[PDB]
Every structure is written in structure tokens, then in C-alpha cells.
Design an enzyme around this catalytic site. Structure first.
Site, PDB file in Angstrom:
ATOM      1  N   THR A   1      -3.961   8.695  -4.222  1.00 36.29           N
ATOM      2  CA  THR A   1      -2.528   9.554  -3.877  1.00 36.29           C
ATOM      3  C   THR A   1      -1.654   9.624  -5.127  1.00 36.29           C
ATOM      4  O   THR A   1      -1.412  10.559  -5.428  1.00 36.29           O
ATOM      5  CB  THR A   1      -1.887   8.653  -2.834  1.00 36.29           C
ATOM      6  OG1 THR A   1      -2.564   8.432  -1.875  1.00 36.29           O
ATOM      7  CG2 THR A   1      -0.421   9.068  -2.562  1.00 36.29           C
TER       8      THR A   1
ATOM      9  N   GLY B   1      -6.499   6.457  -0.362  1.00 37.92           N
ATOM     10  CA  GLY B   1      -6.387   5.301  -0.733  1.00 37.92           C
ATOM     11  C   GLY B   1      -5.158   5.207  -1.661  1.00 37.92           C
ATOM     12  O   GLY B   1      -4.452   6.281  -1.854  1.00 37.92           O
ATOM     13  N   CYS B   2      -4.657   4.217  -2.046  1.00 40.25           N
ATOM     14  CA  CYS B   2      -3.240   4.130  -2.865  1.00 40.25           C
ATOM     15  C   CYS B   2      -3.637   4.744  -4.241  1.00 40.25           C
ATOM     16  O   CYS B   2      -2.831   5.762  -4.391  1.00 40.25           O
ATOM     17  CB  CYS B   2      -3.174   2.750  -2.993  1.00 40.25           C
ATOM     18  SG  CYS B   2      -4.346   1.587  -3.514  1.00 40.25           S
ATOM     19  N   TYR B   3      -4.212   4.288  -5.243  1.00 41.25           N
ATOM     20  CA  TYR B   3      -4.573   4.871  -6.420  1.00 41.25           C
ATOM     21  C   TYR B   3      -4.828   6.376  -6.461  1.00 41.25           C
ATOM     22  O   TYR B   3      -3.997   7.323  -7.023  1.00 41.25           O
ATOM     23  CB  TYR B   3      -5.887   4.579  -7.255  1.00 41.25           C
ATOM     24  CG  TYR B   3      -5.601   2.720  -7.847  1.00 41.25           C
ATOM     25  CD1 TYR B   3      -4.815   2.711  -8.867  1.00 41.25           C
ATOM     26  CD2 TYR B   3      -6.213   1.730  -7.393  1.00 41.25           C
ATOM     27  CE1 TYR B   3      -4.405   1.445  -9.554  1.00 41.25           C
ATOM     28  CE2 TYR B   3      -6.049   0.631  -7.915  1.00 41.25           C
ATOM     29  CZ  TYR B   3      -5.234   0.481  -9.030  1.00 41.25           C
ATOM     30  OH  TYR B   3      -5.014  -0.969  -9.501  1.00 41.25           O
TER      31      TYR B   3
ATOM     32  N   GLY C   1       1.221   4.546  -0.534  1.00 41.49           N
ATOM     33  CA  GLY C   1      -0.246   4.227  -0.996  1.00 41.49           C
ATOM     34  C   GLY C   1      -0.992   3.782   0.240  1.00 41.49           C
ATOM     35  O   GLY C   1      -2.149   3.795   0.212  1.00 41.49           O
TER      36      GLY C   1
END
Lengths: 345, 345, 345, 345
Positions: free
Chosen positions: D152, D148-150, D317
Site C-alpha cells: 500500500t 498488504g501493508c507494505y 495498511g
């Protein structure tokens, strides 16, 4: 307070604006608010920013009783207004913010709105709510059709000029811009932050519902059918509206004449400010207020002039003007509860 | 890489764009860079976003050795470029992004720029860099004057139409909009986020330096002096530009004809896309690319048409076109290092 | 009307806010305005959005006479306030919006502000203007140091909790966010629209001038030296501020207890609203108003809790609180001229 | 081109990003795209900004022939991914951008996602796509779960530090921020421009689906169950993400040590840049690129440190990392078609 207000369609932005404006109005108090899908809920639930206020629970318009209400603001959808307003008690002063009662020509309403006019008779007693222009008729009207946002920015500058025969009525080209708040709170893909931010685009090209409204006002003054070119543009901002108007001046007329006419026509008007020459107005400067700033400039093309007119689309372009109209309709000072100063920055 | 590029005036946005574009250009490499106040500074200092690249240390124009480069991109301000470029080595291919070499009429440059042309002779060998229109002349030019942003969005659509006599050359009214990045990185109060955000305003009303540039291009095609109305507007966004052009079609000419002419004139052009009639272009759609999207619409006023033309003001409106020109000037494929796709959302 | 107000340093945003707020204040009227860099100039020339107001001409501090005013608002630039305020007449009630009188420990002021305190004696009669907390002392003070924005969002929630020993005073971590309007109107490259828009970044990491202000307030309540972690973040927006506070609850304490304490401490407070557990406040909801919304949430880490506190940095974070303080200092109702409702959207 | 790419779920932002990234990829070519609701239509009809590319016409999953492609990118909805991927032909290299295959603990997936894992067996052969950390395992995997973005932005800095025992694993507090593009293109009221612009708010407080993903990665390195505090915040911007991480350093460790460890762990990494101590990263600086910038700072609280990590939530992300993984999975250079430089301003 001594005046009780009913708000039909309180879940939208214009409804929220009405509530915001009335909050510190010394004489008007909201006592009835209607909503469709959100009937039964408090408004804090719909609009949490209003939690400092004590408002009545949202109810259905069909279950609303106006025996203790004095006046009504209508912010219902195009499709409902006419029949609902027609079936409203006669003792009520009504200001409709929708467009359903703006056009006097029935056939015209039908061609532009896609449906028959369902209150043909009532229509003839309706007064167009462009306050600074029709103030006197507005004061004695029971039902007022509050003008649209764009039309307001256009007629204020052009009506006085046409009345004084200072500009020709052909080839009036209007390139307008508006913040996305004018599109409403409807949950549509096109209006998401990610789709709107950092870019612009035109919309309603060639044909936009405000066209007939604009031409009606101009035609009445010019006493001749006026055909304009009007192109809206969507701005990556919440509030704000500007119309850049390109007109042809009448023979022998100079920009100075247009300026003087405007300065004279609005010199004692609280909400319409005519800026000095060469001064460029900014939507930022009227943001969050009921003010309209306009300025005149010479066009590079000989014989032509450029007029810039700005307002906060949600205030003077909607709810602000609506309240401005109700004030005088009820016999109160026109500026009552409408002296909020621009929120800049 | 094969070609060594010199960048005069790298501390501004157009300079940063040149550096960004060349980063993945297979044949051009930046080996020399100029800055004024920030000379001696590493560009990670001026533009930290460029830290992934290994670039030269910024030097002063006075200390730069131009025999060390093959081609040069000039991004200095208007009124500095003439004497510097005039003194540059004769073996250099030059693309000036400033406006100092765009106007061929000397007296015209002086009246609009407030100072005498200091390279009168050199001026006559300069070729206007509107790639899709003057491609053939650009290929064999040594010094190219890269067009301004607004002028690019206007001439691409109008030149072909005027050439084909499909539109009249009187009363061409242009209402343009641009992101604030076009104002540069200069530290001015008017361009602060708090002053620009959530609002719009016109600027350069009546007289704007792009006017003579616009008229020069149109006049050359119409073979008659063309006088236009051009009004810029500042948008609360970084990148993006749109010109909404209001023209009068020639007798018997319909919007379909304008559309066909444009579709034909740019059918094999990578960077100029003509959308289907009725389709509204959006600046969001070309953001961060070298593309220009245009569309034609009928005006409500009979005989008139509306043309919308958009680009990213920093790319096709500046550095992107500059590179597009240098590519062919050096004998490389025109689209080399310019196929970046729009960054949307 | 009755009270004459003097504004020292009217050319900045906090100054503009004071003028905006006083516009519809029933008893206070601006009669004197300082602004040296622009003395002898009209306010409309500095802030055109204020053109609806009839405001005094801008004057140099030196040329200004303060026995004309009954009270003064000081919005001067840091390191310029102490000596000016020290020389003001004593029959003047003063509210300083700068940070120069907030710290009571002189050595502390010097280490954090880089210069000696030039009004050491006067400093001991100064009262910190966090209205809801020091109301009683504020009413009888002559000189009030209006708190900073961030500190206001932090102390309102934490003071009551520390006083009730509901949270430990170690490891209080504050991750705050603020609109760029807090950076002022200074013409700096870093605050241009093109540099700020579409992105965020931290600033004042480890050491920020609000740290000592924050710790002073917390230390006084905890009756022990409190050391916090405070990290500011710059938001791509004009107004708005949020502090996300991570605290450790005291032994046996649950989030419900923190909520009840806050609900009790501010139940009759107009400007401080404690939301229901689980409800997330939004800076959008207090934008353009003097309100502060706060909420408590459990942290995933056992024993910890999360507190969110938001305000409009320019109003309750500055000029709004300043006026809130002056109201009671002059014996007027605290909420006078401060009931503006949030401007949303 | 050599490799044929299939894109499942092309109508969303991550899908558009995949298409944008592959546009100039020298070896991968999109030959199959699935968008059920909008099947039969053109990609241009959905994302007009992609009109410069010649893409195949949108198809339905149930009508796609996967024997036609060499690799697939899955951007389908959560809950529809497991069963679809489980039935995909064995000859395909698959990179799932959804979260359905990220968690290895089945019970964990069920409690956090509200439904049984429908591909329990396949799950054990899945490799987490955090490229710089699991590169070697990723190269030989058939099915990769793109992070996921966060997560990462959090694992990249913390994994190396935990592995080297430089920080404690208790009380790791993460205050993250993200542009609204991460919310997707779903037409929801909450994500309209008018609702998002000019303000911020937290979301997913206490419990957010990324929590288990974050803790899984950290727990694996710390070889002990790690419980963190993670609070997301919605930013009024399109792209960009920042995690401000508050950690406790291990006994005897100093910020310099954390910095050196990070500098060493990523010194030869193209996409992960460790800034010099004290230098604050900006999401603006990685906007539109696959880069991650991180920096370490001392916390005012002794023993604590602050880590800032930023990326473009849509690239590194999401789609950028997805491509980064597919590159090596197919034996191509990791940076292939991923060297786009940040689009600033």
C-alpha cells in the site's frame, strides 16, 4: 585461566549474563555449558551477540562430567534444580540462581512452590547469597542460594534498619517495578513487544513467590515474624528494578537516623551506594552494572519514611550477585570482573 | 457547527488533545486558538500531525477577541490562568485545565504554588471538574477547574469508599506511575528520549503539587482532614497512568464490600469500569480513550486492601475530562465526541 | 596508572562514553576534564551514573593545563575544535571526535560546514581514524580525526570491495538508521521521548554532513570521484546503527565473491565480524560493544547485492573507535579496554 | 444498525482493529465473530481493552451462520482462507484481509506461498482493494482482496508516476520499515519485548511475500514486467510503516514534476496527503489513523529521486483500508467511520 566454570542452563538470560560477565573475568573461564532442547548447538546459534567469544558446544546436564570443572552456576528451571544439585559431586562449589534453595522452612517451600522439597537434608547447609549481608557465611559455603531480584532490593535497605530497631516491622509496604527481562526468554504472548510496550500493569498481587523469601530475611533480623505487603509491577523496559518502600519509623526516630544508619552500614561497600538526602535514584543509573543505589525520604504522613532502592535486575538482581558470591567462595577478590560501569544512556 | 470553541494555549500536548477530540465532535468547533512563542504560526507548524484539519492561525492571548467564542478551554501553565480568566467575558462557559482554580483554600494555594491567589473572589464560584462525582454541580457552573491527572485516578475509587465508611482515612498510601507525556512538551534535558527510555524513577517525593488537591477531595468526603502519602513515578512510555492504592479497610469490612460499593457506584457510568475481583487492569487497555478501569484486591496484610486505578493521563486525566465537563455545561450529552475506543496495541 | 588522559568536552554522551570505557582501562586514566557551560561542577552532577568513579572536577578550557596529560580526547561542539586543537602543546597525542579535521579538501569543509577552515596547515598532518583500514598510518600520527558513526558502518564494508574492483562505484545507495543518542544530549523539542518514541522518520535527506566524509573515503579507494545516495533515519531507540547498502556488482562478480573478499579482509579482525551468507545482523547484537557485524545478500535485481553493516553508534561509531585509535597511537594493544561484550538483552 | 458484520478470525490484531473501527461506525455493526481456538469465550477475555463494547460471544467458523450477516471481513490465516471464502454464501459482500486472493497469476501464488491455489475460478472475479487506485472496480466487486501493508505504501506513490511515465521502471529500490505489530500476536520468541526493543534488523531479504504483490501492481501500470528490490526492516515500535523509495526519473523529468503529478493525483483524496517539497513525513503523524503522507526529494545522484511514504500499518495498511473498501462496496460514503485523527503523542 586458572578457574574452570560450568554453567547449567545457558540458554536463558541469566545464563547469557553469566557468560557476558565471565568474558573479561581474569580467573574464571566457562568450559562447560548445558542446555536441554538446545543441547548439541553452539551458543552463537542461541545468542548471536556472543559471537566474539569462543565457547564450548552446549551439552546435556546428564552427559556432563565435572572432573575438570571447579565451580558451577545453576540457571535451571524451578522443578529440576533440587534433584540435579543434590546429585552433583561434592568437590564442586555451587551457586544456584534458582529459588529452590532459598527458603529454609521446607513446609514453606512446598506451600509456595507447589511441590515437595526433594533435597531436605542438603537444604540445611545452604547459605543465602545476599553478599553484603551474609558475606562471612558465604565465603565458607559450598552451596549458595543466590537471592531473587526483588528480595535483593528490599533486604539491603531494610535489614540494617531493622537490626538497629530504627523502623517498626508492621505495615511495611513495598511497591516494586521491574523490566520485563525478569520474565525470561520464554515465548509467551503476554511478553511480546506489542503487548508490553507503552504501558504498565501490576502482577503477583497479594501472593508472589518472592514474599516468603522477603519475609524470611526480614524475620531473621527482626527476630519476630514479619508480614509485608509486596506488589510487583511490569515496566515497558528491558533492564531495571526499583522498590519504593513505605515504612513506619520507630518511636523518636527521624529520617536522618535511617539515612545515617544506611550510610554507615554501606560506607565501604563497592556495590551499595547510599545517596545524599533528597536525591532520587534512577534505574537508568545502574543499568548494566552490579550497583545498587538507595535513598531515604520523609513520608508526608508523620512517623513514616520512604526508601527507594534500585538495581539492574539481571546483574545485582541475579547473575552479578551470583558471580560476586562465587568470587569470595573461591577466595578471590569480591569485585573481580564486576566493575563494569553503568551503560548510560 | 453550533458551538464556537476558544482554546487558550494550543501549543502544548493538552491543547493538541483538545483539538484532536473536537475534530469529530458533532457540535463543537474550534474557531480561536492561542499560543505563546509559536503565535502567528500555523498549527501544521507546531503539530504537523493535525494537517488533515482546517484550523485557525495561532494568535497571542493579547490579540485574541473572546467575544468571538461561546466556550473556552484553558491550557496555560499554573500562575497565569487566574488573571487571564478573571478578565474573560462573563458570557463564556470556561473549563480551566490548569491547577490554579482547583484549591478552594487560598492560603493553601499560596503555600503549594508559591504565589498569591490573584482571583480570590472568582474562586468561590468554581466547581471541581471530577465529572462522575460532581456532575450535578458541574452542569450549572460557568467556570470549572478541570482536575489533575493523578488526582482523578485516586478520587474516583476512594471517594465512594470513604463516603460509605468502608475504609479508614489514615495511612492511605498511593504509589503512582505516569507516562512522560504528563511532563509536557517543554524542551528539557531530563525529558529527552535518551534520558527517559529504558528506566524509571520516582519524583515529587514527599511533596508534590497534587497532594493538596488529593487531600481536599478526600477530606470533603471523609468530613475530616485526610493526610495521605503520594509518590509519583516516571514511566518510559508516552501515555498511561496507574495509581496503586494501599488502604486500611474499616473494621469488619472485607474486600468484597469495597468491590460491591464500587460496582454499585459506577455501574451505569460509561467511563468508569470496575473489573471483576482479581482482575488486573492495564494502562495499555485505556490508552487513547477517556476510560478508567479500576479493580480491588486483598492485601497480604490483614485488614488492608489494594486498589488499582488506570487512565490515559492525557484524556480522562486531562483534555478528555475537560470536554466531558464542557459537554454537560452546554447541555449536550456527556459522552458526545468521547467514545473513542482504546488504541491497542 | 601510567597514562594521563585529558577529555575536552566531557558533558556530552561521547564524553560520558570515553569516561565509561576508560574506567576499566588498565593503563589510561582520566586526570583532566573540560566542560565550560558546567565548569567548576562535578561530573556526578552532570552524569550521576558515574558516581562509582573517582573523577576529576570539571574545568574551563581556558583554566586547563595540558602538559599534565599525555594524550587528549576532543569531544567539542563543531566549529570550536580547529582553533583549540591548533593551540594544544605538540607533545600531546590527540584524537578529535569532532568532524572538523576529517575532510582534507579545505573548500569542501567550508561548503559543507558553513565556515572557513581555521587550521589549514595542521590539517595536512591529520590521519583519518578508521582503525581497521588506516591502522598503520594511525599508529604514527599525532593528531587523528575520529570518523563519524554512519561513515564507519559504510566504509568498512565498501572499501575492501572497491579496492578489489568487486563492485561498481555508481549508484551506491545507502539507507541508514540510527538510535537517537547520536543526536546528542542537547535539550531540543524534537528529541523528547514523547516526540521520538513509537515512530521513525528520515532526516538529512539529499544533503547530510557525512556525505563528503563518505565519498572522500570511497573516492580514495576507487581512485575516481564517487557520488553516493545517503539517507539517514531516526530510530526510536537509544543506541544502534545500521546501514543497508545497495550496490551494483562488477561484471562477472557474484555475491559469493563479495562475501569471500570481506571474510578475507577481516578474518583476523577482533571488531569486524563477517557473518555467514544469508545471516541477518541485528543492532541488538553489538549494543554496548565496539563490534561491527556485516553480511552480504543477493539483490532481487540481477547484478545487484545488499550489504548490511551494524554497530553501536556511540562505541565503534564514536568513543570506542577513538580509544581504539589512541591505544595504538600510544603503543598499547589495540583491543586494550575495548573487549566489553554486547549488553543483550 | 443497518448493516450486520461478520468477522472471521477476531482474535488477532487486525481483528481487534476491525472491532475498534466499527465501534463508532454509524451503520455497520458486528454481530458475528469467529475465533476457533478461543471459541465460547468473550472478546473481553481475549482483548480486555474492548470491554466498553457489547459484542456477541466468540464462535467457531464451522458453527457460524453467514445468512445472518450482510458483509464479512476475513482475517483468517493464510492457507485457510481460499477454501472458506469459496464456500461462503453468494449474497455476501466480502473483504479478505489475507494475501490469498491478491495475486491473479495462479502459478505465481503457488511459488510464493508454497501451496496450490484452491479457488482458481473465484480468483478471476476478485478486485485488489487499493482504494484510491481501483475505487471504481471496488464499488461493484463482491469479493475484494485487501492489499498488504507494505504494498500500500509503495503503490500509492509509484502507480501515478509510472502511469505518467515520469520515472523509469528499472532499479526501483525500496527500503521499508515497520512496527512489530505487523508480525501479529503469535507467541514467538523473536517478537518478545526483550528481543525487539532497542534495536532494529532487516528481514525477508531478497525474497518476501509482498514482492510479487508489489510487482503485480507496478507491472500493470507500466505495462511491462517490473522487477524491484524490496527490503523490510523491523522497528522497535508497535505501529507505523515507512517506505523510502529510490527511483530513477525519466529523461528530462525533475523532482518538481513528480511532486506535481502526485499533488494532482491525490489533491481531493482524504486519506492520501502529499506534503510540500522538502517536508519530511513522520510515521508518528499518521499513527492510529487511516492517513498516508508522502513526500518527494531529489537524490544526490543526478537523475534520481527519493520518495517517502508512511502509514499506520494496522489501519491504512490493513483494517482501515478494509473498511474503506467495504464502505463503498455497500454504497456508503468512503470515509464513514474512518475519520479518526492521529494519536500524537
Amino acid at each position: 585461566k586458572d578457574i574452570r566454570i560450568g554453567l547449567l542452563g545457558a540458554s536463558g538470560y541469566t545464563g547469557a549474563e553469566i557468560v557476558r560477565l565471565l568474558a573479561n573475568h581474569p580467573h574464571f573461564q566457562v568450559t562447560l555449558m548445558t542446555a536441554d532442547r538446545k543441547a548439541g548447538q553452539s551458543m552463537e546459534s542461541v545468542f548471536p551477540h556472543l559471537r566474539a567469544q569462543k565457547l564450548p558446544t552446549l551439552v546435556s546436564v546428564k552427559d556432563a562430567d565435572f572432573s575438570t570443572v571447579d565451580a558451577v552456576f545453576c540457571c535451571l528451571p524451578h522443578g529440576t534444580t533440587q534433584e540435579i544439585i543434590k546429585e552433583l559431586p561434592t568437590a564442586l562449589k555451587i551457586v544456584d540462581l534458582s529459588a529452590d534453595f532459598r527458603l529454609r522452612n521446607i513446609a514453606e517451600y512446598e506451600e509456595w512452590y507447589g511441590q515437595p522439597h526433594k533435597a531436605v537434608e542438603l537444604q540445611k547447609e545452604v547459605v543465602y547469597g545476599l553478599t553484603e549481608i551474609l558475606r562471612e557465611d558465604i565465603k565458607k559455603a559450598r552451596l549458595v542460594a543466590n537471592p531473587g531480584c526483588y528480595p535483593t532490593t528490599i533486604q539491603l535497605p531494610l535489614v540494617p534498619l531493622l537490626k538497629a530497631n530504627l523502623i517498626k516491622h508492621e505495615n511495611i509496604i513495598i511497591d516494586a517495578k521491574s523490566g520485563v527481562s525478569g520474565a525470561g526468554r520464554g515465548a509467551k504472548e503476554a511478553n511480546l513487544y506489542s503487548e508490553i510496550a507503552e504501558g504498565i500493569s501490576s502482577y503477583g498481587v497479594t501472593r508472589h513467590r518472592h514474599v516468603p523469601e522477603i519475609e524470611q530475611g526480614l524475620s531473621d533480623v527482626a527476630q519476630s515474624k514479619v508480614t509485608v505487603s509486596f506488589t510487583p509491577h511490569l515496566m515497558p523496559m528491558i533492564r531495571g528494578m526499583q522498590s519504593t518502600i513505605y515504612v513506619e519509623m520507630a518511636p523518636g526516630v527521624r529520617t536522618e537516623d535511617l539515612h545515617q544508619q544506611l550510610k554507615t552500614s554501606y560506607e565501604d561497600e563497592e556495590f551499595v551506594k547510599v545517596l545524599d538526602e533528597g536525591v532520587v535514584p534512577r534505574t537508568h543509573n545502574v543499568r548494566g552494572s552490579n550497583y545498587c543505589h538507595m535513598s531515604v525520604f520523609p513520608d508526608r504522613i508523620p512517623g513514616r519514611a520512604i526508601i527507594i532502592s534500585v538495581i539492574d535486575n539481571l546483574v545485582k538482581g541475579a547473575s552479578g550477585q551470583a558471580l560476586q558470591n562465587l568470587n569470595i567462595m573461591l577466595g578471590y577478590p569480591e569485585t573481580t570482573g564486576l566493575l563494569h560501569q553503568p551503560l548510560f544512556p
